[PDB]
């Protein structure tokens, strides 16, 4: 797991940017799928264009060799393959493509590349969206809304995750509860609750409750419920070592946990978003994509990421007679999904309003 620290720092730089944009919308994205997509894309780039991408993924190219970077990602794909994800490359049908790139995309990163007639904008937009919808079986519809006029290369990265808890909730105990969108305003949401033994603890550094729940597939969801007026403090203080320390501890205590059902999405323009992380040339006219096509000019004019999450109710636990704490996730909270093997950040998000 040599590239795990870089993924974690890429997750945070990506999160802190989205949280800076707007603080009133739900955030949810996959650092792993985005970084894998652009690490794979780098195989067809050279020189500054190539360096901007790996550096943009938080890889110090003067310290870690690229062989380890791609080896780390491919070793992560072997682990990762209910999680449905896909990355589609759509290239203009008039381009002479380099076989090496198409091999690397299919063999090494297990991704898909298609040739499109970008002369028909509406039909290109349809084939792109039909591909996503077919890969998510209708969960993600009409992803791409528009295409630039000079579009000759589009990238689409989708991921849909349905969480199956190790310790499930009982549907009969789910009912409507207030969700405090702020200190004086509430909104009713469906709220799951269970009295049991949880990996839960209040953290002084983070000023937050920290809940860890395993789900089926050797991965763990970490929820950070900040104290009153501590959301910004929580987001600033999060580090990979703090997260790793929590994964190490397995001690449980009793609590009456209230956790809302979640059906949230995140749709992001990777050209805009990754542009503020330093990845700009691959989207510009001076892009060195000579590993993709050898003679014609090429640039990535479209890159979209959509991530969809479903949290619901989806072994006997002995509960002491002491008064259990009441931990309600009824206000904005931060969360991550961590793969247990590689410790890599599968997903990261913030719920400002489950009903949004």
Residue numbers in the entry: 24 to 104, 111 to 343, 352 to 393
Task: Copy text verbatim from the article accompanying this structure deposition.
Mutants of alpha‐1‐antitrypsin cause the protein to self‐associate and form ordered aggregates (‘polymers’) that are retained within hepatocytes, resulting in a predisposition to the development of liver disease. The associated reduction in secretion, and for some mutants, impairment of function, leads to a failure to protect lung tissue against proteases released during the inflammatory response and an increased risk of emphysema. We report here a novel deficiency mutation (Gly192Cys), that we name the Sydney variant, identified in a patient in heterozygosity with the Z allele (Glu342Lys).
